[PDB]
Design a protein around this ligand. Structure first.
Ligand SMILES: [Mg+2]
Ligand SMILES: [Mg+2]
Ligand SMILES: [Mg+2]
Ligand SMILES: [Mg+2]
Ligand SMILES: [Mg+2]
Ligand SMILES: [Mg+2]
Lengths: 274, 274
């Protein structure tokens, strides 16, 4: 289809971006600050994003873009019906600065505000995760399938603590963690990137992911990888998944997703579309 | 080197154990319970430990053992001066049951109650971490070096929440995580195994690991990997590291280790030698 040519190009670009990231991770880096001393950015995040947007814009000039570093530079993160490339040039910048081995390039592609395809390249691992609506999810050609776990007490969750250090926000994040932890669940894991956490759910290695504070670019690529692997996306309220809401539950099934939603208390957050 | 032959044999056995683990991870399994509803054990944990102890006895019949599942079977958790093999047949049994991709076979070898060599095989990843006292630390033949970071606010920490679900214990674990998180630190990660968390600090991918509730077998293999990579081991009190204490800080340096010790509160625990 015409979107298959877009998807094939997106895989090529994700690989080229991953090579740049892989090369940069070995060298010294000037770590820069965004919103706080814990919200990081490097020249690599910015360079990768400029290369991806200029590459896609040259090939598809009528297409729209939503990129993390472009939004930090003053661009509007508004989602229209027009074909839109939703990019996180480096998802896991903190991991990248530390050489913690989970660093992803994420590309989500939306038509009529609905994701048609996703590409998440975990470059340190050399794992290319891809999915196209109705075509299934893959990691390096291996077809992915979510786990069958329907018992919350035998489940393994993934989450991240977030970029906020506000004492009130931190208490809510840890209280939500305590509640799920004491259901009990088998455990909670954190690899340091929303996109990779979600791909782990798509593989069946974890049963569900949840987070508040993420943005459309963190989840646009991985969301469709989870659903094409047989999983589900939901808001933390239990309502329909909304890409611009800052909230997500990405699980193997509705039973676990709904059970997680019941424990979570919502953190007030500025939507991506406001 | 009189212990180089024992170490060469330990690498062979850890790899042979890892092949057993890799093969078993693909299939459905009966999951048994230990100290809590989330403290798991399988026929694979038990089989691997038996295979390791019997292979060690064949070559070194005078040697002693401390094994996780052997201790669970009622074997004496005792550390004598005799050459001792300290084994965690599967470190990350929860990950193993879930196919979460961090599962380690860990062997620490002690003489006069001090670690002489350590082997940690992260089987899913295919990463063999090894170290001999005074000979350096390696991952698949590549020399390891801890990071240089001396500023806690620019550090990435690794830890685990533990097998306990006793509300007071859970409260203390999360409270310690909050205090560190708000210093601030760049972040906190959890791959689900003490041995692999420690090996990530030896690589320089994380700056420090801390945990209370672990056992000698969780840390005996990886502790020497951290130190041979240029790091340090300390008790959570700031005092010298003690293998049987259930407490550990494994850091790139004493500056970060001391700052973590100053910030957290001790959880009361039954020592492995009491
Ligand atoms: Mg990013
Ligand atoms: Mg991101
Ligand atoms: Mg960022
Ligand atoms: Mg074990
Ligand atoms: Mg263990
Ligand atoms: Mg165990």
């Amino acid at each position: 289809d015409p979107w298959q040519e877009c998807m094939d190009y997106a895989v090529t670009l994700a690989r080229q971006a991953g090579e740049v990231v892989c090369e940069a991770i070995k060298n010294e880096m000037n770590v820069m600050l965004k919103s706080s001393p814990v919200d990081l950015v490097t020249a690599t995040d910015q360079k990768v994003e400029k290369m991806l947007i200029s590459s896609i814009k040259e090939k598809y000039p009528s297409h729209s873009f939503i990129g993390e570093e472009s939004v930090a530079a003053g661009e509007k993160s508004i989602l229209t019906d027009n074909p839109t490339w939703i990019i996180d040039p480096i998802d896991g910048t903190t991991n990248f600065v530390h050489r913690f081995p989970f660093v992803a390039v994420s590309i989500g592609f939306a038509v009529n505000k609905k994701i048609e395809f996703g590409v998440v390249y975990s470059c340190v691992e050399g794992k290319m995760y891809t999915a196209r609506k109705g075509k299934g999810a893959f990691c390096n050609g291996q077809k992915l399938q979510v786990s069958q776990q329907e018992d919350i007490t035998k489940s393994l969750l993934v989450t991240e603590l977030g970029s906020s250090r506000t004492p009130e926000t931190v208490r809510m994040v840890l209280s939500n963690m305590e509640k799920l932890f004491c259901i009990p669940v088998h455990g909670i894991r954190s690899v340091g990137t929303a996109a990779v956490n979600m791909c782990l759910v798509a593989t069946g290695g974890a049963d569900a992911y949840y987070e508040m504070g993420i943005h459309c670019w963190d989840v646009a690529g991985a969301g469709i990888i989870v659903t094409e692997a047989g999983g589900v996306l939901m808001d933390v309220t239990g309502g329909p998944f909304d890409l611009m809401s800052r909230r997500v539950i990405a699980a193997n099934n509705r039973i676990l997703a709904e059970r997680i939603a019941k424990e979570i208390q919502v953190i007030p957050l500025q939507r991506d579309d406001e």
